[PDB]
Ligand binder design. Structure first.
Ligand SMILES: O=C(Cc1ccccc1)Nn1cnc2ccccc21
Length: 330
C-alpha cells in the first residue's frame, strides 16, 4: 500500500503545517501537525477540558463504531518549546491520504497547554519519530508509520514541505517527479529516538563551504533551524544590523534587509536554503525588527533541522531495518 496527503502551512509565516487525517468510523477528519520529532498521535477530543478548546476540531470516540478505550492507558508529553498535553488512549482506524491503519493508538487529550489552545488551526499531532519515544503508559504504543510499515510498498515516508505553499507527505513510495537531481542518503542514529544525522558543513550566501560535522535531528514539528552558536553568528554577521536580542529571544534583523542564503551539507551534496526562507517577519505587529529563521541551539542541547531547512529539500525518512535519511534539491 501507499498514501499521499497534502500538507498546508497554518499561517503566512509557515509556522507549522497541517495534514488532514481521518479517524474513526464514520471518519472524523482532523488537521494534524506531522512531527518527525515526536512519537505520539494525540488529538483534541470530546474529553478535552472545555476551557482549553478554542476553535479546534475535536475527536469524539463515542461517535466512532471502531473506537475502543485502551484500558488503563494514559499519556503525557512535553515538547522542547515548553508546551504539553496529556490524557487517555483509544485505539481506532486512522487513515492518511488513502493509507489505513486499524488498531492505531489515538491519544485523547484531557489537558493541553495554552499554546495549543491558542492555535485554532492544529487539532493535534501525529508523531513520526521512533516508537521508543512514545509516552503511553504502562504499554508503549507504536506510531502510525511503524504500524503501517509492513504493509507499505517500501518502508519509507517522504516530506516535501512548501515555502508559503502546500506540500506533500507520501507513505510507501518515492515520487521521482518531486525532486531534481539525485537523493543523497546519510546515516541515522536512533539512540535518542530521533531521526538524528550528521551534516557535513555549511556556507553563508556565496561564501566558501566550511567542512565540519554538525549532528542534529530532522524535525518537521520544529519551525526554525537551530544550529551551534558559532554557525549562527557567522550567518547573522552577514546581515547589516542583525543582533541577538535577549529580550526577544534570538537573532533579529532589520525588516529592510535582504537575507543571504544558507547552505548545509548532506554527504558531498548541498542543500541551499534561500534567504527569504529565513525571514519570520516583524517581532510584533508593525515593528521594523524581524525575527530570524536561523537561531542558536545552545540553550536546547541538540541541533534541529526544522522546517526552515527541511522545506528546502525533498526528504526521505527511510524506515528500513537500518534507517537512513535522504535529501534532494527540488
Ligand atoms: O519542541 C521542539 C523544539 C524546540 C523549538 C523551539 C525552541 C526549543 C525547542 N519542536 N517540536 C517538535 N514537536 C513539537 C510539537 C510542539 C511544539 C514544539 C515541537
Amino acid at each position: 500500500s501507499t498514501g499521499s496527503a497534502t500538507t498546508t502551512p497554518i499561517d503566512s509565516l509557515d509556522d507549522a503545517y497541517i495534514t488532514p487525517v481521518q479517524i474513526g468510523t464514520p471518519a472524523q477528519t482532523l488537521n494534524l501537525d506531522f512531527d518527525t520529532g515526536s512519537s505520539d498521535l494525540w488529538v483534541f477530543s470530546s474529553e478535552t477540558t472545555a476551557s482549553e478548546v478554542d476553535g479546534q476540531t475535536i475527536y469524539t470516540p463515542s461517535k466512532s463504531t471502531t473506537a475502543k478505550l485502551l484500558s488503563g492507558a494514559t499519556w503525557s508529553i512535553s515538547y522542547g518549546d515548553g508546551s504539553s498535553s496529556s490524557g487517555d488512549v483509544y485505539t481506532d482506524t486512522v487513515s492518511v491520504g488513502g493509507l489505513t491503519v486499524t488498531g492505531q493508538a489515538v491519544e485523547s487529550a484531557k489537558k493541553v497547554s495554552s499554546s495549543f489552545t491558542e492555535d485554532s488551526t492544529i487539532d493535534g499531532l501525529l508523531g513520526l519519530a521512533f516508537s521508543t519515544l512514545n509516552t503511553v503508559s504502562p504499554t508503549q504504543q507504536k506510531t502510525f508509520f511503524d504500524n503501517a510499515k509492513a504493509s507499505l510498498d517500501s518502508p519509507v515516508f517522504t516530506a516535501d514541505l512548501g515555502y508559503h505553499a502546500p506540500g506533500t507527505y507520501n507513505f510507501g513510495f518515492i515520487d521521482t517527479t518531486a525532486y531534481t537531481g539525485s537523493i543523497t542518503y546519510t546515516a541515522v542514529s536512533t539512540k535518542q529516538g530521533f531521526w538524528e544525522w550528521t551534516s557535513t558543513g555549511y556556507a553563508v550566501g556565496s561564501g566558501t563551504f566550511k567542512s565540519t560535522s554538525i549532528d542534529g535531528i530532522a524535525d518537521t514539528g520544529t519551525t526554525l533551524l537551530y544550529l551551534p552558536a558559532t554557525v549562527v553568528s557567522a550567518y547573522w554577521a552577514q546581515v547589516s544590523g542583525a543582533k541577538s536580542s535577549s529580550s526577544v529571544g534570538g537573532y533579529v534583523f532589520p525588516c529592510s534587509a535582504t537575507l543571504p542564503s544558507f547552505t548545509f551539507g548532506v554527504g558531498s551534496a548541498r542543500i541551499v536554503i534561500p534567504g527569504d526562507y529565513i525571514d519570520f517577519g516583524p517581532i510584533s505587529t508593525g515593528s521594523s525588527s524581524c525575527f530570524g529563521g536561523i537561531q542558536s541551539s545552545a540553550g536546547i542541547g541538540i541541533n534541529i533541522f526544522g522546517d526552515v531547512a527541511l522545506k528546502a529539500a525533498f526528504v526521505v525518512f527511510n524506515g528500513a531495518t537500518t534507517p537512513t535519511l535522504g535529501f534532494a534539491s527540488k
